Amino acid sequence: AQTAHIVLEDGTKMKGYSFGHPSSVAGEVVFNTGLGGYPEAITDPAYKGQILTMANPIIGNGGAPDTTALDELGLSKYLESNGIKVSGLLVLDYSKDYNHWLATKSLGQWLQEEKVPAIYGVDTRMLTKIIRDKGTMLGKIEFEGQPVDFVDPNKQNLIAEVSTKDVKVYGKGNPTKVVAVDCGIKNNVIRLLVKRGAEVHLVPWNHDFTKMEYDGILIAGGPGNPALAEPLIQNVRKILESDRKEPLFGISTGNLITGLAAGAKTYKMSMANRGQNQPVLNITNKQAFITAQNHGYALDNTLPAGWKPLFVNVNDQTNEGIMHESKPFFAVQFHPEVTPGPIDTEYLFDSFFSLIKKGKATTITSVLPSRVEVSKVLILGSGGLSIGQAGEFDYSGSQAVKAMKEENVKTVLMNPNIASVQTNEVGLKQADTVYFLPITPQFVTEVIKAEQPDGLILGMGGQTALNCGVELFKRGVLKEYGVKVLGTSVESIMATEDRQLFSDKLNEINEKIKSVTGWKEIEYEVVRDADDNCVTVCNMENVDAMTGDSVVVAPAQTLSNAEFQMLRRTSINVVRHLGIVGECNIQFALHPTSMEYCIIEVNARLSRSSALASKATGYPLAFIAAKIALGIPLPEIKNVVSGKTSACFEPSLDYMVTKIPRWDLDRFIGSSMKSVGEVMAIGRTFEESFQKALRMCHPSIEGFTPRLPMNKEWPSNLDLRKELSEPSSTRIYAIAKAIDDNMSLDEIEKLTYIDKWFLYKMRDILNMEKTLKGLNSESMTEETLKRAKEIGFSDKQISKCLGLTEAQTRELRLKKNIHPWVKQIDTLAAEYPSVTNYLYVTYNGQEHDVNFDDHGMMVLGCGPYHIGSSVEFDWCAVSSIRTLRQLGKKTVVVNCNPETVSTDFDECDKLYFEELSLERILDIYHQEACGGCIISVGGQIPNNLAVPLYKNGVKIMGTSPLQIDRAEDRSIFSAVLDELKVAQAPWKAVNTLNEALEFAKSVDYPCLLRPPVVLTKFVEGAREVEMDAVGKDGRVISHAISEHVEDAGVHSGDATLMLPTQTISQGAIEKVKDATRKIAKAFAISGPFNVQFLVKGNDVLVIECNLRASRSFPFVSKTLGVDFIDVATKVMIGENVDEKHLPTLDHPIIPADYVAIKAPMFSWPRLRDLRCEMASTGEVACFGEGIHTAFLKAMLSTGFKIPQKGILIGIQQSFRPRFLGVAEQLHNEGFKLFATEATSDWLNANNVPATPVAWPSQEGQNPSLSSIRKLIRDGSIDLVINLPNNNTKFVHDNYVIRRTAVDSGIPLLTNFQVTKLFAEAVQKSSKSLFHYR
Ligand SMILES: Cc1csc(NC(=O)C2CCN(C(=O)N(C)Cc3ccc(F)cc3)CC2)n1
Ligand SMILES: [Zn+2]
């Protein structure tokens, strides 16, 4: 475009691109924090003379409506006045491509038609920070060759400029005559009057209405200094001094004029009130309301005789309305007609008409009409399985703990996982008492009996805690012990959980719960307090839904004001009607080309949505929900981010967030291919946020690209329309390919259901990539590179377009001084200064929001959870960050996983919720000038960056990245082991097919393969042992040896661990230790490390070494009473450690009186091709007198009933001789045995009783044999053993069997060693077994 500058009178200059009328304009520069409804906004007469800075960084998504259409009254149908009223517009990103069913044209076309200048590409947040609290900031949009001077339009009578010049009548023939004095009235005021039976006589600002006949009078505006409207003030003064008693209703300018006429004073506010999130309080009844405001002048708080304040601003204590003590005269400083904004104060129009209908009264007459004492509260933590629900982690319980501690309420927390991150807490988040018990009705009853709490929080531990609290309620246990449910009542909860009860409750307020395919899916997070104050804190739009695992953006992007405000209001109505006291999530389907919607569901407990919404906004939902449960109202709770304002507000976001689920694709489609984590990315364009989130999913992902990752090729036979219409693991790449193959966007939207707005942004990314591909290091301009970075291109992406390396591209970019900017997530779009340390990084800006004087220690997080990289690394993070804090070291945390506890800006000095790439970590490290980086405590992601960080100026703490590299290179590590005389299984990296075959024969079958391919001899019937350890200058100073239950196999990171060892020889232990001593010296280890070993009798073979903390670090730490991460962090930073009491190699800590077990929280089958495997995640860790009781306690802790009745036996035919003994053992403990016919017959022929059952695929073929499903449903089978079976005819049935157990919530054993452990433990052996601290 042509470019133009925004120049402020203080000297601030920002260059932007013109998208409106290309001429210069001068005016007052203002900002408004309201995000939605820019068409309604920019037609507000209040902006006359003003250049408006938009908080919402993404402007124009809905285009412009039909700007000439009129409604039945002769008013603009879709606008708030007869044209655009702003003098100009300043935005971060202008969407040239729009998509909305009411759009007729682009916002830029509209602006051009109206002659309004507008520029994009300017830092609207920086402009906000500059304008705020200055009173009047003059500025100008200036084009080259069109110089203009600063002018203050407030020095002229703007009221007169916008007022009607003659009397206009709307609602002709209606019964109630209302005179409206036009001080820049909005159209919606007139619509709301007429709807109520007014015939509205709209009169000029200076019309002498004083002797007119009317039933009521209304004054509304608008722009300008109310003091310049003396003829109006004098006329209103005449009314007030008369004996006229018609009701008077002032809106905004009305409030000021009515005040002045009464004898009050007005002033020009240092800090104006302009937003759609402005909290006010009715001073009379303490009720809070969220309002739309757009005023820069206010009434002085000293009011004249006969007048009282009606509303007050909750943030800044300014007047927000006045009322006469006896006459029906009142005004409000906000806009109850909204448009845009929250439809929460429309009842003021009802009040006005009520006053007219009586024969006199006050507005008070017709206006709408810590209490619980708790001394000890029981908080139900994150628990086990919930039948027909995915499996959840939810540690929000700890925020509840923190809230209770600030109110001097004693806390008891239940969490059965002894190594949970939730209980790894030592300050405000530590419960006074923790019980390590299952989250089940029996156990929670025992804690109630023991502790005698008077309150219970049941809505902050996921579905299982909820089901549990509800069951205690139903059985009378809560009544019996005097335990109050804090927050939403169980009666209200039951109404949301039962589909039918929910429908009936909704039908009472004329709302409703068929295919919603291709409807827009929008969700709101809502908080309601015990005083019936009810706010929306976040809203989200599903980009693409393929069970709650959608790609989501926040805020919603494609809604109009009408749609957004319609759903927002329904949310509030539904939440209040349901009796919510705390948080609630509500999900809508909205028809994509009308106003029709329906409610999909409500969730009256904390959820993945509420955790995402807290991360996206910085509003601490769980903490606030816990304060609400104590009956504290929103206005009386602090906004933790601002420090100076309350929880009674709706966040305004000057960035956009993108969340993407993390799919289970690491092992290498939808049948058993689930969401195992999530990422969230922040940007100030959609594109920036979007590419960043894609990269966050996995390091092989470059951004948005039509090329499959890992250099794979699209099939030659590809049917693209087919790929687009069914979920796949390559869906996003298929969309990119469709766009790039010139499939129309309309067709892509028809096939995918993704709104075309999003597809336009995707197309711009691909178009940028084409632009970049015709350029080179010499010809690419600064402007192009800047734009590419602003829409989320990485240096690596750019490098492939230009034919450069990544490093050369970074260098090139920094030579042009193109770098990103550190912004704060402040919850208020800069309305108030924040001192938050909750940060992101964007190219869309012109300043940083923080200083870089800390020079802190960086700690890198683990990225999205997935199989093998789970909650254990959150525990490691928490411990390492606390060690640093305890030693007085400033910390910088970087992570992008919104499910983590460690991304808590209250526990670290700077939290960057950012991409864990080399590029972004270097940006953050060098901008902060960090003193070092810890890459050892976040799993593989950070550790794999060791060497690239080290080569780019990063000080890595602890073990040299050069050593990490040697140890994790198979060829180098193996030659080091050869030289030290440490054994390992034979192995080869093979190029050719004839090489692979010759090796497989050189050492006998089988062999293991893994990604030029690595062959290793597979050793059969071996044990596996984990060594977790901490080195210091090459000396092992802490170690723990654990033993896998399962024989060494293809699964490791699926294995159940026993500590200390149970069936390992003493000689093998000595060899494990000796090998560990040698490895630590050979790699000069200073920090955490793990070595895995195969053991067979006395033969000990190293499998591999990971020179970083492993997932078993929490487990071994809690088991031995020594925090291995604490010790390692100390070593890595050079802090001294006393070794006298550590588990060194010469003096191990071997528990005597107990054994610990670590097992997966959730397991489920996966169909492959042909075979069936298990996947598992999460952790449960328990202690027991021995491994047998530990194991039973783990089973109860994961939410299972210990089997008693019947066992389904499924084994491969060749495994029969080995299994017969265990079968008899299980039978001799009183289990009835079931098996498929041939197995059943074989058992019976060996004198082990069994009952035959049908294979699922053959249930038709014989009505005489029982079905597995029926035997499970009726409780005959309460355990399924289903061991590996390579018979390909039954692979699918074995998958079905396994899926049935998992879905019915009964235990499923798929390994022989684990089956033997169970069999032994039930010989050996619910309440009795357990535990606590
Ligand atoms: C090895 C591995 C582990 S995880 C992984 N790849 C991913 O996680 C990708 C799969 C492709 N993918 C995808 O198709 N998505 C999420 C659909 C999508 C739809 C709309 C969007 F806006 C973005 C993504 C994203 C993540 N690869
Ligand atoms: Zn105000």
mmCIF file of N, CA and C and ligand atoms in Angstrom, residues 543-546 549-553 658-668 673 676 686 690 693-694 696-701 704 709-710 728-735 754 758 762 864 866, ligand 1:
data_model
loop_
_atom_site.group_PDB
_atom_site.id
_atom_site.type_symbol
_atom_site.label_atom_id
_atom_site.label_comp_id
_atom_site.label_asym_id
_atom_site.label_seq_id
_atom_site.Cartn_x
_atom_site.Cartn_y
_atom_site.Cartn_z
ATOM 1 N N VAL A 543 -11.759 -24.249 15.660
ATOM 2 C CA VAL A 543 -11.343 -24.121 14.280
ATOM 3 C C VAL A 543 -11.793 -25.324 13.478
ATOM 4 N N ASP A 544 -11.547 -26.500 14.064
ATOM 5 C CA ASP A 544 -11.655 -27.791 13.415
ATOM 6 C C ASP A 544 -11.810 -28.830 14.510
ATOM 7 N N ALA A 545 -12.949 -29.514 14.466
ATOM 8 C CA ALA A 545 -13.286 -30.579 15.417
ATOM 9 C C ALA A 545 -13.307 -31.950 14.714
ATOM 10 N N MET A 546 -12.474 -32.875 15.214
ATOM 11 C CA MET A 546 -12.215 -34.210 14.615
ATOM 12 C C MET A 546 -12.549 -35.349 15.595
ATOM 13 N N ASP A 549 -11.133 -32.587 22.002
ATOM 14 C CA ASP A 549 -9.807 -32.457 21.362
ATOM 15 C C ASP A 549 -9.951 -31.741 19.987
ATOM 16 N N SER A 550 -10.401 -30.516 20.065
ATOM 17 C CA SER A 550 -10.477 -29.689 18.899
ATOM 18 C C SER A 550 -9.237 -28.753 18.834
ATOM 19 N N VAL A 551 -8.942 -28.239 17.662
ATOM 20 C CA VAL A 551 -8.092 -27.071 17.537
ATOM 21 C C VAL A 551 -8.969 -25.882 17.876
ATOM 22 N N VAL A 552 -8.490 -25.001 18.759
ATOM 23 C CA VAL A 552 -9.264 -23.939 19.305
ATOM 24 C C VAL A 552 -8.488 -22.631 19.219
ATOM 25 N N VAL A 553 -9.202 -21.543 18.941
ATOM 26 C CA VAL A 553 -8.643 -20.216 19.149
ATOM 27 C C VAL A 553 -9.400 -19.417 20.248
ATOM 28 N N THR A 658 -3.844 -20.054 20.193
ATOM 29 C CA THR A 658 -4.172 -21.217 19.422
ATOM 30 C C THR A 658 -3.755 -22.402 20.232
ATOM 31 N N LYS A 659 -4.693 -23.302 20.471
ATOM 32 C CA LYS A 659 -4.411 -24.562 21.156
ATOM 33 C C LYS A 659 -4.623 -25.687 20.136
ATOM 34 N N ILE A 660 -3.703 -26.628 20.141
ATOM 35 C CA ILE A 660 -3.780 -27.809 19.239
ATOM 36 C C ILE A 660 -3.577 -29.058 20.113
ATOM 37 N N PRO A 661 -4.441 -30.067 19.941
ATOM 38 C CA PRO A 661 -4.175 -31.310 20.657
ATOM 39 C C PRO A 661 -2.919 -32.017 20.170
ATOM 40 N N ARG A 662 -2.282 -32.792 21.052
ATOM 41 C CA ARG A 662 -1.115 -33.527 20.710
ATOM 42 C C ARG A 662 -1.591 -34.946 20.525
ATOM 43 N N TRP A 663 -1.474 -35.425 19.292
ATOM 44 C CA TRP A 663 -1.909 -36.744 18.960
ATOM 45 C C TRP A 663 -0.815 -37.793 19.248
ATOM 46 N N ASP A 664 -1.255 -39.020 19.427
ATOM 47 C CA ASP A 664 -0.352 -40.145 19.776
ATOM 48 C C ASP A 664 0.251 -40.713 18.512
ATOM 49 N N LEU A 665 1.236 -40.031 17.956
ATOM 50 C CA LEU A 665 1.808 -40.378 16.650
ATOM 51 C C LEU A 665 3.293 -40.699 16.703
ATOM 52 N N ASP A 666 3.872 -40.677 17.888
ATOM 53 C CA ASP A 666 5.295 -40.901 18.073
ATOM 54 C C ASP A 666 5.772 -42.330 17.693
ATOM 55 N N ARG A 667 4.956 -43.337 17.974
ATOM 56 C CA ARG A 667 5.287 -44.730 17.628
ATOM 57 C C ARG A 667 5.121 -44.959 16.131
ATOM 58 N N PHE A 668 4.230 -44.185 15.487
ATOM 59 C CA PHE A 668 3.895 -44.193 14.030
ATOM 60 C C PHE A 668 2.828 -45.227 13.702
ATOM 61 N N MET A 673 -6.526 -43.841 18.282
ATOM 62 C CA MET A 673 -5.485 -42.836 18.038
ATOM 63 C C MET A 673 -5.919 -41.504 18.729
ATOM 64 N N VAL A 676 -3.289 -37.138 23.687
ATOM 65 C CA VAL A 676 -2.486 -37.390 24.876
ATOM 66 C C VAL A 676 -1.837 -36.140 25.465
ATOM 67 N N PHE A 686 -3.264 -14.176 13.753
ATOM 68 C CA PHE A 686 -3.640 -15.599 13.679
ATOM 69 C C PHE A 686 -2.485 -16.444 13.196
ATOM 70 N N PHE A 690 -0.743 -19.557 14.992
ATOM 71 C CA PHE A 690 -1.031 -20.831 14.312
ATOM 72 C C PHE A 690 0.217 -21.610 13.961
ATOM 73 N N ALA A 693 1.954 -22.797 17.094
ATOM 74 C CA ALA A 693 1.369 -23.936 17.757
ATOM 75 C C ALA A 693 1.664 -25.238 17.024
ATOM 76 N N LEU A 694 1.609 -25.190 15.680
ATOM 77 C CA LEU A 694 1.965 -26.371 14.861
ATOM 78 C C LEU A 694 3.398 -26.825 15.203
ATOM 79 N N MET A 696 4.992 -26.367 17.923
ATOM 80 C CA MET A 696 5.019 -26.841 19.292
ATOM 81 C C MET A 696 4.641 -28.317 19.394
ATOM 82 N N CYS A 697 3.836 -28.790 18.453
ATOM 83 C CA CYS A 697 3.383 -30.181 18.520
ATOM 84 C C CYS A 697 4.524 -31.199 18.441
ATOM 85 N N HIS A 698 5.480 -30.987 17.534
ATOM 86 C CA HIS A 698 6.586 -31.894 17.420
ATOM 87 C C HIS A 698 7.722 -31.215 16.636
ATOM 88 N N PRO A 699 8.990 -31.505 17.000
ATOM 89 C CA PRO A 699 10.122 -30.869 16.297
ATOM 90 C C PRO A 699 10.251 -31.176 14.835
ATOM 91 N N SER A 700 9.632 -32.215 14.356
ATOM 92 C CA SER A 700 9.676 -32.503 12.916
ATOM 93 C C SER A 700 8.747 -31.564 12.154
ATOM 94 N N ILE A 701 7.904 -30.782 12.846
ATOM 95 C CA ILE A 701 6.905 -29.907 12.177
ATOM 96 C C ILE A 701 7.537 -28.522 11.980
ATOM 97 N N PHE A 704 3.072 -24.396 9.003
ATOM 98 C CA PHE A 704 2.046 -24.783 8.069
ATOM 99 C C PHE A 704 2.669 -24.997 6.671
ATOM 100 N N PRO A 709 5.740 -34.262 6.935
ATOM 101 C CA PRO A 709 7.008 -34.183 7.689
ATOM 102 C C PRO A 709 7.919 -35.421 7.430
ATOM 103 N N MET A 710 9.176 -35.340 7.886
ATOM 104 C CA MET A 710 10.165 -36.451 7.749
ATOM 105 C C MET A 710 10.336 -36.874 6.245
ATOM 106 N N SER A 728 -7.689 -37.678 9.686
ATOM 107 C CA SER A 728 -6.426 -38.367 9.449
ATOM 108 C C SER A 728 -5.343 -37.690 10.260
ATOM 109 N N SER A 729 -4.261 -38.416 10.451
ATOM 110 C CA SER A 729 -3.065 -37.910 11.077
ATOM 111 C C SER A 729 -2.286 -36.890 10.252
ATOM 112 N N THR A 730 -2.663 -36.717 8.994
ATOM 113 C CA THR A 730 -2.001 -35.768 8.108
ATOM 114 C C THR A 730 -2.965 -34.658 7.662
ATOM 115 N N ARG A 731 -4.050 -34.483 8.400
ATOM 116 C CA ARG A 731 -5.148 -33.583 7.981
ATOM 117 C C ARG A 731 -4.652 -32.162 7.631
ATOM 118 N N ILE A 732 -3.797 -31.580 8.497
ATOM 119 C CA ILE A 732 -3.426 -30.187 8.277
ATOM 120 C C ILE A 732 -2.572 -30.038 7.007
ATOM 121 N N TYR A 733 -1.756 -31.047 6.729
ATOM 122 C CA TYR A 733 -0.904 -31.067 5.547
ATOM 123 C C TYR A 733 -1.780 -31.232 4.313
ATOM 124 N N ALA A 734 -2.847 -32.019 4.428
ATOM 125 C CA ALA A 734 -3.814 -32.205 3.324
ATOM 126 C C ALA A 734 -4.528 -30.889 2.979
ATOM 127 N N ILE A 735 -4.890 -30.126 4.010
ATOM 128 C CA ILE A 735 -5.489 -28.802 3.808
ATOM 129 C C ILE A 735 -4.504 -27.872 3.111
ATOM 130 N N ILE A 754 -14.139 -26.151 8.112
ATOM 131 C CA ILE A 754 -13.385 -25.067 8.658
ATOM 132 C C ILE A 754 -13.856 -23.757 8.006
ATOM 133 N N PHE A 758 -10.448 -18.707 8.433
ATOM 134 C CA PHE A 758 -9.242 -19.368 8.773
ATOM 135 C C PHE A 758 -8.494 -19.790 7.499
ATOM 136 N N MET A 762 -4.519 -19.243 6.179
ATOM 137 C CA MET A 762 -3.676 -20.309 5.717
ATOM 138 C C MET A 762 -3.141 -20.069 4.278
ATOM 139 N N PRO A 864 4.514 -30.661 24.980
ATOM 140 C CA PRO A 864 3.233 -31.321 25.196
ATOM 141 C C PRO A 864 3.453 -32.742 25.715
ATOM 142 N N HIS A 866 2.839 -36.622 26.035
ATOM 143 C CA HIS A 866 2.541 -37.668 25.050
ATOM 144 C C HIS A 866 3.056 -38.988 25.692
HETATM 145 C C1 LIG B 1 5.859 -37.639 15.377
HETATM 146 C C2 LIG B 1 4.699 -36.757 15.750
HETATM 147 C C3 LIG B 1 4.216 -36.673 17.026
HETATM 148 S S1 LIG B 1 2.895 -35.585 17.037
HETATM 149 C C4 LIG B 1 3.106 -35.322 15.300
HETATM 150 N N1 LIG B 1 2.361 -34.565 14.495
HETATM 151 C C5 LIG B 1 1.412 -33.795 14.972
HETATM 152 O O1 LIG B 1 1.210 -33.640 16.162
HETATM 153 C C6 LIG B 1 0.591 -33.060 13.928
HETATM 154 C C7 LIG B 1 -0.360 -34.009 13.172
HETATM 155 C C8 LIG B 1 -1.048 -33.128 12.125
HETATM 156 N N2 LIG B 1 -1.960 -32.237 12.822
HETATM 157 C C9 LIG B 1 -3.233 -32.008 12.343
HETATM 158 O O2 LIG B 1 -3.576 -32.458 11.246
HETATM 159 N N3 LIG B 1 -4.124 -31.247 12.982
HETATM 160 C C10 LIG B 1 -3.971 -30.861 14.378
HETATM 161 C C11 LIG B 1 -5.413 -30.803 12.427
HETATM 162 C C12 LIG B 1 -5.444 -29.337 12.407
HETATM 163 C C13 LIG B 1 -6.631 -28.731 11.990
HETATM 164 C C14 LIG B 1 -6.820 -27.372 11.962
HETATM 165 C C15 LIG B 1 -5.793 -26.573 12.376
HETATM 166 F F1 LIG B 1 -5.960 -25.262 12.366
HETATM 167 C C16 LIG B 1 -4.588 -27.104 12.780
HETATM 168 C C17 LIG B 1 -4.418 -28.484 12.788
HETATM 169 C C18 LIG B 1 -1.229 -31.503 13.903
HETATM 170 C C19 LIG B 1 -0.221 -32.114 14.714
HETATM 171 N N4 LIG B 1 4.128 -36.016 14.818
#
